[PDB]
C-alpha cells in the first residue's frame, strides 16, 4: 500500500509506495498507536522507528482509534472528533458514519507514520532540511519563555527579531509583526483601578442609604413616642 | 390515635420534641396544633381547631389554599375516603324555543375530617390546586338539612 511518512523534528513529509507483502508483513497486525522498526520497510530505513498514526482504506474510510477490529463498522460520532468533521452542521448534531478499525490489515490503502527515532543514514527527502516555523509566539509569556527574559526585560524589542520582511507582487516593501497579547499596559492597570473604584463607590452608596433610612426611621419613631406619651 | 398508616403522620413544621412548652405560642408554634382562617368570610370549624387528625389537604390545617371559584351544591355521594361528589343543578337555556332544560354537573371535592356530611345535605366548596385526577375543590361549609 501507500505510506505517508512525517518527520516532526524537521517538519517534513513524504509519500512512499510498497507492493511487497514480505515488507508489509511487519506493518500487518499492528494497531494505530504501536511502533514498528523500518528495517523491513526497505534497506535505507535502517535504525528508524516509525509510530503509526492511522490511515485510510480502499474506499477512503478512515481508521478510528479504539475500534479493535480489522473490518469496517458504523458509529454515531460527535462533531469535531476524528472521522467526523461536521463542518456547517448544527451544535449537538451527531451523525452515524462508517469507520475502519485501528488494527492494520491488507484492506488499507494508505497508512500514516511519524518518525520517532532517527536511523544511521538520513533520507534525501525528509531529514536534510527543516522548514522554519512561519509564526512565532504571540503571547507575552510565550515570548518571554522563548527568549528567557526576566520580569523586567522589555519583550517589546524581541518581536522585531522574528518579524518577517518581504516584497509584494507590486514590488512594495512590507513587514509584519504579531500583536502581543496578555501584555500589561497602563490601560489595563486603569481598568483594574476603575473596577476597584466602582466597587468602593457601590459599597459607600449602600452604606449611606442604609444610614439615611435608619435615621429616618429613628426620627419617625421619636415623633411617634412623643405622640404616644400624651 | 390517627396513626393508621405505614408512616408517621404529623403536621409539617410543627416541632413536637421541644424542651420548652407552647403556652403563649401561636398555632403552629411551640408544638401547638397549626390552623388558619381561609378568609372570604368563612369561619374555621371548632373541630379543625381542636382536632387530632392529620390532613395535608385540609383547607384550615393543611397546605392547600382556597382561591378561584366558590360553588354550592348537594352531596351526591360520600363513599370515597375524604372525598365526595357534589351535584350542581342548573338550567340550560334553549334559545330557539326560549325555554330551559334541566342539567347537572358532578364535581368531586375533598372533605376534611372536621366536616360531617351525608348524601343529601347542602355543601359550599372552594377551588384549590389540583389534588387528584379529578378533585379541584375543597369542602368549606356544610348545611346538614
Amino acid at each position: 500500500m501507500k505510506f505517508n511518512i512525517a518527520n516532526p523534528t524537521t517538519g517534513c513529509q513524504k509519500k512512499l509506495e510498497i507492493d511487497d507483502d514480505q515488507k508489509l508483513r511487519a506493518f500487518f497486525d499492528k494497531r494505530i498507536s504501536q511502533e514498528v522498526s523500518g528495517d523491513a520497510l526497505g534497506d535505507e530505513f535502517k535504525g528508524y522507528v516509525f509510530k503509526i498514526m492511522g490511515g485510510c482504506d480502499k474506499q477512503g474510510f478512515p481508521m478510528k482509534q479504539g475500534v479493535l477490529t480489522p473490518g469496517r463498522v458504523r458509529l454515531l460520532l460527535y462533531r469535531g472528533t476524528p472521522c467526523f468533521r461536521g463542518y456547517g452542521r448544527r451544535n449537538g448534531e451527531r451523525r452515524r458514519k462508517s469507520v475502519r478499525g485501528c488494527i492494520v490489515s491488507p484492506d488499507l490503502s494508505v497508512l500514516n507514520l511519524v518518525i520517532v527515532k532517527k536511523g544511521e543514514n538520513d533520507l534525501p527527502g525528509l531529514t536534510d532540511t527543516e522548514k522554519p516555523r512561519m509564526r512565532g509566539p504571540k503571547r507575552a509569556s510565550k515570548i518571554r519563555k522563548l527568549f528567557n527574559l526576566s520580569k523586567e526585560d522589555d519583550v517589546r524589542k524581541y518581536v522585531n527579531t522574528y518579524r518577517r520582511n518581504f516584497t509584494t507582487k507590486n514590488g512594495k516593501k512590507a513587514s509584519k509583526a504579531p500583536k502581543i497579547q496578555r501584555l500589561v499596559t497602563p490601560l489595563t492597570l486603569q481598568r483594574k483601578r476603575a473596577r476597584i473604584a466602582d466597587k468602593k463607590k457601590r459599597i459607600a452608596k449602600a452604606k449611606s442609604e442604609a444610614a439615611e433610612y435608619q435615621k429616618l426611621l429613628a426620627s419617625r419613631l421619636k415623633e411617634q413616642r412623643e405622640k404616644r406619651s400624651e | 390515635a390517627e396513626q393508621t398508616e405505614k408512616a408517621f403522620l404529623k403536621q409539617p413544621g410543627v416541632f413536637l420534641s421541644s424542651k420548652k412548652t407552647g403556652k403563649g405560642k401561636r398555632p403552629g408554634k411551640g408544638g401547638n396544633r397549626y390552623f388558619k382562617s381561609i378568609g372570604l368570610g368563612f369561619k374555621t370549624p371548632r373541630e379543625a381547631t381542636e382536632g387530632t387528625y392529620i390532613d395535608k389537604k385540609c383547607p384550615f390545617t393543611g397546605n392547600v389554599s382556597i382561591r378561584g371559584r366558590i360553588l354550592a351544591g348537594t352531596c351526591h355521594s360520600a363513599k370515597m375516603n375524604r372525598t365526595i361528589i357534589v351535584r350542581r343543578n342548573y338550567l340550560h337555556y334553549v334559545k330557539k324555543y326560549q325555554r330551559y332544560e334541566k342539567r347537572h354537573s358532578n364535581i368531586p371535592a375533598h372533605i376534611s375530617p372536621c366536616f360531617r356530611v351525608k348524601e343529601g345535605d347542602h355543601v359550599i366548596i372552594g377551588q384549590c390546586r389540583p389534588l387528584s385526577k379529578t378533585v379541584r375543590f375543597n369542602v368549606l361549609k356544610v348545611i346538614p338539612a
Binding site: - | 396513626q3 398508616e5 405505614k6 408512616a7 408517621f8 404529623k10 416541632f15 413536637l16 420534641s17 421541644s18 424542651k19 385526577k133 379529578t134
Partner: protein, 186 residues
C-alpha cells in the same frame, strides 16, 4: 421517553381518549435515581428546563443530620436503611429515598454532647461554670440514651437524594421515635 401527560389516561367517565398530538418535551419524565449506600460516592449533574441544574445521587455515604431537641446539625455516616413505608423491597436494596428510616453514626453527636454538657453518654473555671449552668436544664430521652449506647441513631431522611443529591435528615424523637421503634421491634 417517560411522559407525565394525561392523554394516555382514561376519562373520569371511563371512556377512552383519542390522541390529537404527539408527546411534548415540556411534559417529560426521567428515570429514578435509585440512590444506595456505598463508600463510592457518585452524584450526576442533570441540565433541566431553563438551564437549571439537578443532582442525581447514585451512591451516598454521609448525610447532614439534625438533632432537633438540642438544635445541633452534624455531618454523620449513614449506616443502613431499617424501614421504608412506601415499599419493603427498598429496605432490602438499601435504597435512599425521602422519609426513609435509616441508622446514622452517633459519634459527632456524642462528641458535641460531651463538649457542651460535659457528660459522656484542664477545664478552666469559666468553662466548668458554663457547663454547670447548662447542667440545670439537661433533660435527655431514655430511648435516645439507649440508642447512643449502641452508637447508632434512628433518623428520617427529609431531603430528596434524587433531586438534590444529598441524604439529609433528622434524628427521630418523642412520639415519632416511639412509633418507628414499635414498628421496627417486630
Amino acid at each position: 421517553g417517560i411522559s407525565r401527560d394525561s392523554m394516555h389516561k382514561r376519562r373520569a367517565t371511563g371512556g377512552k381518549k383519542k390522541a390529537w398530538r404527539k408527546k411534548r418535551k415540556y411534559e417529560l419524565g426521567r428515570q429514578p435515581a435509585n440512590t444506595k449506600i456505598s463508600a463510592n460516592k457518585t452524584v450526576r449533574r442533570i441540565r433541566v428546563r431553563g438551564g437549571n441544574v439537578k443532582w442525581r445521587a447514585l451512591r451516598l455515604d454521609t448525610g447532614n443530620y439534625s438533632w432537633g431537641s438540642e438544635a445541633v446539625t452534624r455531618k454523620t455516616r449513614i449506616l443502613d436503611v431499617v424501614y421504608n413505608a412506601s415499599n419493603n423491597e427498598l429496605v432490602r436494596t438499601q435504597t435512599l429515598v425521602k422519609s426513609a428510616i435509616v441508622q446514622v453514626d452517633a459519634a459527632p453527636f456524642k462528641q458535641w454532647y460531651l463538649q457542651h454538657y460535659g457528660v459522656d453518654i484542664k477545664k478552666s473555671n469559666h468553662v466548668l461554670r458554663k457547663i454547670e449552668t447548662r447542667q440545670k436544664d439537661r433533660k435527655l430521652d431514655p430511648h435516645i440514651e439507649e440508642q447512643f449506647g449502641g452508637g447508632r441513631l434512628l433518623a428520617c431522611i427529609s431531603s430528596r437524594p434524587g433531586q438534590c443529591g444529598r441524604a439529609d435528615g433528622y434524628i427521630l424523637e418523642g412520639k415519632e421515635l416511639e412509633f418507628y421503634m414499635k414498628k421496627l421491634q417486630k
